[PDB]
Design a protein around this ligand. Structure first.
Ligand code: NAG
Ligand code: U5H
Length: 346
């Protein structure tokens, strides 16, 4: 089940500390499908808080200690029983070592203690994979969880543009954003989350998709980190997986028996998330308190309206060949409290 580490041949494309970035790959020679998964794990946004992350979360800032292999799990598993959706695909795990929500385009230098190269890491992984078989692909699914899910939204159209400009117009680029669809909502108690993104973008030289940038304009690029604002600007097909009560959303909202004020807050959050997905035709949004799903081994277990996530993704593939009989692609729970769906993870 193992994916093998390859450090980037272009060693100018680096993790935060200047060590080379890389990717883990398991090829499937009989397949023209490629799954490129972006790991998540928050971010850091100034010298002091990146230094702390370097002390105790160093694998998210450096390749120096990465293992030579990783086991593929969930959507990265090659076992049909664990991955009914894409078990025969070529599998790529791209470690998150740039701490920039995959948006950065800044090298380490005499003025920069850290490199923030997430956007460039994605493009360099794609370039190097073209020499390893990606050139023959029919579908490239850029997937990701948490900050990696936001990274999908920020980067899927740039991957599509890169392959067009390199002369590969037959590769269909698509996105799968898991747990990366956040609300810039009012907190339950008062930390300034949107301010941290704004500061981060300046620290990272962060880049956002061009059409979204042109809408919000200079200084307001932080808006494009919020799915409901950036998604309408995207041209590539994007399937959105989002728990209605995402634990990271609750964290940025300062939410941890439940009285009326908090009950109303939680119910309003789920309703707002539901509302932002009403016109997202490929989506899976269960009424659960959880965080991430697609690379979890039991990702097969959750269902919305009787349809599992692997089935919904399979129906999405069919829709991209009018709605499909018994094969839905838009699956959003309507019940208003975490675990009102009996299939929620424990
Ligand atoms: C290596 O990466 C750097 C930084 O992204 C880029 O500017 C440069 O063109 C790359 N070199 C090659 C040979 O691909
Ligand atoms: C990008 N994000 C994560 O990786 C988890 C939480 C989310 C976020 C939203 C708003 C402000 N800061 C962070």
């Amino acid at each position: 089940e193992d994916l093998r580490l390859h450090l980037l041949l272009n060693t100018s494309v680096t993790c935060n500390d200047g060590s080379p970035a890389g990717y883990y790959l398991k090829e499937s020679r009989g397949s023209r499908r490629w799954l490129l998964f972006l790991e998540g794990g928050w971010y850091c946004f100034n010298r002091e808080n990146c230094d702390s992350r370097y002390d105790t979360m160093r694998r998210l800032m450096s390749s120096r200690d990465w293992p030579r292999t990783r086991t593929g799990t969930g959507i990265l598993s090659s076992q049909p029983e664990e991955n009914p959706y894409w078990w025969n695909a070529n599998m790529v795990f791209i470690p998150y070592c740039s701490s920039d929500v995959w948006s950065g385009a800044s090298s380490k230098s005499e003025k920069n203690e850290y490199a923030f190269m997430g956007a460039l890491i994605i493009q360099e992984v794609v370039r190097e994979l073209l020499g390893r078989g990606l050139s023959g692909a029919k579908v490239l699914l850029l997937a990701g969880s948490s900050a990696g899910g936001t990274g999908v939204l920020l980067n899927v159209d740039r991957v599509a543009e890169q392959l067009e400009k390199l002369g590969y117009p037959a590769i269909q680029v698509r996105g799968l954003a898991d747990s990366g669809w956040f609300l810039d909502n009012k907190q339950y108690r008062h930390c300034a989350p949107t301010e941290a993104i704004r500061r981060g973008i300046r620290y990272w030289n962060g880049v956002v998709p061009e059409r979204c940038r042109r809408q919000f304009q200079e200084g307001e690029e932080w808006n494009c980190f919020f799915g409901y604002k950036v998604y309408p600007t995207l041209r590539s097909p994007v399937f959105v997986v989002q728990w209605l009560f995402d634990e990271a959303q609750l964290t940025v909202d300062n939410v941890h028996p439940v009285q009326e004020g908090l009950r109303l807050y939680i119910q309003n959050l789920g309703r707002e998330l539901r509302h932002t997905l009403k016109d997202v035709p490929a989506s899976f949004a269960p009424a659960c308190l959880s965080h991430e799903i697609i690379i979890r081994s039991h990702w097969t277990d959750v269902q919305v309206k009787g349809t599992s996530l692997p089935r919904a993704l399979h129906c999405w593939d069919r829709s991209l060949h009018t709605p499909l009989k018994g094969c839905p692609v838009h699956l959003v729970d309507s019940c208003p409290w975490p675990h009102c769906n009996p299939s929620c993870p424990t």
